[PDB]
Design a protein around this ligand. Sequence first.
Ligand SMILES: OC[C@H]1O[C@H](O)[C@H](O)[C@@H](O)[C@H]1O
Length: 305
Amino acid sequence: NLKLGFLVKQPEEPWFQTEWKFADKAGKDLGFEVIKIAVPDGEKTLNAIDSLAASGAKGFVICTPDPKLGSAIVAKARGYDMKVIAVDDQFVNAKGKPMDTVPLVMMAATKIGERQGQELYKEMQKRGWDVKESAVMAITANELDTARRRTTGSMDALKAAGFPEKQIYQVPTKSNDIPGAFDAANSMLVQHPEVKHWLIVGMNDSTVLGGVRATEGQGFKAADIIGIGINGVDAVSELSKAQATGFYGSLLGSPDVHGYKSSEMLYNWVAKDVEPPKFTEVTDVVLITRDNFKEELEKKGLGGK
Ligand SMILES: OC[C@H]1O[C@H](O)[C@H](O)[C@@H](O)[C@H]1O
């Protein structure tokens, strides 16, 4: 009978789709209805809450399209006697300090990032690239913490592994999608004619994919590119292709956990006024490649690949 909202920034990415799916499950289990809304931008976010209130929802889980909407979201919520839980992306203040006060469930950004970096270097070593003619292209979205911590973690790990600091080139992307990353990567490539082999660093699948698509456009062959995405579920279409590409594999997270856990906690909070922990960090990761993606998806109950 109880209605709880599940707002996501990017409903077109399997990650978010899966979070929805597992929110549904939680609903089934606990006996509550999930109202699934896309909030791609700030306005739609604020409008969506209004709409929720109309429907007579008692709270919502949200991945905000903008961390800096935090204040507004909370205010609107309070006004409607709605409880909020943040998923994925953390609320920040005007000054861009994290709002500790809102319960969050997110991925262990740093740890996953560092695992990306490890695995990048590992595959490089495998291929016997000459470091001298190799480079790292780091496509960044520094304004998003969880993203920041990811790419920084990757760079740290690479630097730690012995990859020359001076051969790591960062480029900000305007959007956390393929088109965005494509533009970014493209602009960086034409600057570095000397490079023969690229490692591509990005916070998620799409970002890395964007990077890869760009390199192919500048006449790099698969052998000469290593990109490892983050998310896993986002990467399935790529890993499924006949031909191997620059996109070598992905770190599979737990969007199932994100969806289910966040919803479950909201309900309890709403229904039973059981205060969720302020911070939940999900540490799950597995490397999925062309060779294993199918197993691992099925293994994690994210069947289909
Ligand atoms: O929490 C994981 C989540 O982090 C951000 O929201 C990214 O945009 C997503 O694609 C995903 O990787």
